[PDB]
Amino acid sequence: STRKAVIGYYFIPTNQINNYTETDTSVVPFPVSNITPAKAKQLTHINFSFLDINSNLECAWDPATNDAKARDVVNRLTALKAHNPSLRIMFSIGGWYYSNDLGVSHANYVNAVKTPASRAKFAQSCVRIMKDYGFDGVDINWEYPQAAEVDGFIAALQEIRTLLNQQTITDGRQALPYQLTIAGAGGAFFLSRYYSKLAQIVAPLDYINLMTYDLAGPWEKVTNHQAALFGDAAGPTFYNALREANLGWSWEELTRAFPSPFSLTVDAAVQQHLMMEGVPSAKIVMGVPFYGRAFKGVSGGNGGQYSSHSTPGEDPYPSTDYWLVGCEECVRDKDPRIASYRQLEQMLQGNYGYQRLWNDKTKTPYLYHAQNGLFVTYDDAESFKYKAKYIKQQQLGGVMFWHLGQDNRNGDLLAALDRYFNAADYDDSQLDMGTGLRYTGVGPGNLPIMTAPAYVPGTTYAQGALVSYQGYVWQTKWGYITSAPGSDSAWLKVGRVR
Amino acid sequence: TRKAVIGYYFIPTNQINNYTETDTSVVPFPVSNITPAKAKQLTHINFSFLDINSNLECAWDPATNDAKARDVVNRLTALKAHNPSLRIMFSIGGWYYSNDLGVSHANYVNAVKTPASRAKFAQSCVRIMKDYGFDGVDINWEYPQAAEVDGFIAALQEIRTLLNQQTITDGRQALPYQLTIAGAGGAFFLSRYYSKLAQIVAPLDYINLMTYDLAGPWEKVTNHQAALFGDAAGPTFYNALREANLGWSWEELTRAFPSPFSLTVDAAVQQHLMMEGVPSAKIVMGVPFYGRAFKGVSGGNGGQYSSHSTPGEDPYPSTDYWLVGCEECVRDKDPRIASYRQLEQMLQGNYGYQRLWNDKTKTPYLYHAQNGLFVTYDDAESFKYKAKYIKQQQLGGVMFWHLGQDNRNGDLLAALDRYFNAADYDDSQLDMGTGLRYTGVGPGNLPIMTAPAYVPGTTYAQGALVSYQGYVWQTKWGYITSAPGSDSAWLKVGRVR
């Protein structure tokens, strides 16, 4: 085999839409015209970003959006379908700016999912917007619903699913059914908000796009890779917040499922999802960033990795000190803390004194500027080789990236992703995935098949004693016996019987 | 408020059948031992044990000849003439009848299964109470499995309903019928019903903690069976409560249930206080009037924390009565247990025993250098610290197993009464030592704290403290943007404030 999904978010600011032009990059840095028929064939999905939810609790464009210019930008994307019969132009509702807890429209997301009535009105609006503008499906990027809001969120996704399937039959779109996806947290902190209900959340979805990036940044004390595939023992570790999710698991189960502290990595995020019963690997889509994050005031010795820094973490960037040497994009956007891969590639070409280094544990590149104490964490075609192999090995549904507008002019990052999954002349059979740290947690929902002598009433076990009973293999935690496995707190469910 | 002094009083069926106030060899401790003065030192006598029969009703052991039984219960109820606050309760269960492999186990499990069985059982409880002249009901089922707790609870709720109705019908407002249970004093058995402690204790006047038998021949190393506080040099155990179905997060479980921990009286008390809905005034601390003996112990630390060669099997498998000077042991064919009365005589009979004292656990022990014996027991000395703890923690009182094991002068009962009530006893300067205290903290015993009210719209850094809905919460990581109780990033750490 099944083709891997290649889902690219395409983000374009309201101001760029209202002044859309394909002949002036100072106005629209990455116009849809950059996407040739060749590149259209490299994608399976483009998630136009972002639509929002208004106070009327309906899906809607930002009111400041010139409607005429909006449909035109959207028509330019749907025109790409002429070159790829598998291509879907989805629209994504949310994004950090609109939907974060303190975002301009957060209340609208929380209130829209509250009741059968609000959910029905909202779901209908999503389908109407989809049909009105020519989109092929819906992606929800609410960052992020929490505990109390999750059941409504789930019900909302289920309603959207019903309406889409009906729209598919009604439109005779059986050959290219309307789809529904969501973007999900990669880091454990936000993931812990709805982790306990992942199965229910993923059931109505074609795919869950894991945002396995932004795993490091200025807002954290130690410099680190924002998308390390595997962990580096020399890197920082963090408390595994999933231990605090309302799971109903015992201390042993939580500790076994969530090692802590742990390395915030792409592998950790993926394995944490697979650990949950009811979450199929084929629905998991691994996200990768087409941008990097920069830090200043880093110590030398380890290429700037895992060091203290003096980078402002608030938004927007206070200072006017644009210290990311050679980053003119940073000057235009007023922020030396982030740069598109496109810009980073030019900084290297700029002979600005950056050393392109490689961490063979995390399988990711990084720039070190020994002179001004700068560190840049990003991904490239080489780190993509390891992530693409991981996606194949782990039988994930594909790859997702934020965002298409950040690739270079030749479209090298997107071309690399397509190459690794589909090029007949590319062979990663001997690609060495390294010795970086893998995530080791095991949960009650992903128990390995095990074999043990049947439980025998009247026997005295304990301390690592393994027995089979009622479909599971159990292990003693303490004391000794007078309890059938599962009859008390003494037995730990550790494996499944065959 | 007067502290309760609850003495279980166990007299086996054979002794009920051959009851005599005049022959130590037949009935070692008859009712006449309980003089008016001693009756004034008690607030409750838990006559033990009645059982549950196959008709699933409360009943005397089939082998009990009633005439004798009633004569014995009457002698006990006759003691109320000497103390107007005294209650002669009866206890149902005990180890022999009710343990998982006990002779009557099935009956306890079947008695609480349905409303009809419960109603019929609860009614038999009151019938038996009124018929024999008892003043209340104590249940000592050791122990209902977790699946059997809901029925057990509903059963206590029914008995409470019937008892309250009976108190009014009998004009007993001045001395209301009571309902109590003996509760596990160690984490392992406690974990069976721990998560529903608030429900179990609501219908009760008291929960009598069996804070004894915390050490015994069935464990690998010798240890004090009722240490008040912990000794770093002693054994430590897995904290089974961390696995109870509490529904708590990792931080909450870890903070409440450190592991391993020292199995002490203090640990059991605190573990109960940690639960919401469990009032200190209903907790009764149990103490033992007997000691447990081990053989084959290594010298070096008075016999403490040593490997041993004592069989743990229930009936002592042998006729080898190795506990020097212990005549009861011969009499009852088991050298692993001795009444305080016997131990005192073993000490004065100069049989080679040294009375030692552990100032961390605040308990005495006997060491027999020659034969390699170790005995853990309690005395009037250890009772001083335990009585002060009872007062400091505002507990309901003390309970003991059992009255028949005290010496003839009744020194152990007298000490308990003295420490709570004597006008000329003053423990204000008693130093409780540096023994290890249980370090866990839960929802039911949060420390009073103060912090700024939570402000919606504010972002909080890791470690920040705020007050919300009567509690003080602290963030577990940074950049918190939502409210306590509605954001797993917050941990309840204090109260009021």
UniProtKB/TrEMBL annotation, chain A:
Name its species.
Answer: Serratia marcescens
From the Swiss-Prot or TrEMBL record, give the protein name. Answer: chitinase
Q: Which reaction does it catalyse?
A: Random endo-hydrolysis of N-acetyl-beta-D-glucosaminide (1->4)-beta-linkages in chitin and chitodextrins
Q: Which GO terms describe its cellular component?
A: extracellular region
The keyword Cell division is annotated on this UniProt entry: no
Which domain of life does the protein's organism represent?
Answer: Bacteria
Q: EC no.?
A: 3.2.1.14
Family according to the record:
Belongs to the glycosyl hydrolase 18 family.
Which InterPro entries does the protein's record reference? CBM5/12, CBM_sf_5/12, Chitinase_II/V-like_cat, Chitinase_insertion_sf, GH, Glyco_hydro18_cat, Glyco_hydro_18_chit_AS, Glycosyl_Hydrlase_18
Residues of the GH18 domain? 5-424
Query: Which Cys-Cys disulphide bridges does the record give?
Result: 327-330
The enzyme's main class, written as a single word, is: hydrolase
Q: Which UniProt keywords apply?
A: Carbohydrate metabolism, Chitin degradation, Glycosidase, Hydrolase, Polysaccharide degradation
Listed PANTHER family: CHITINASE, CHITINASE 12-RELATED
- For this entry, list what GO says about its biological process: chitin catabolic process; polysaccharide catabolic process
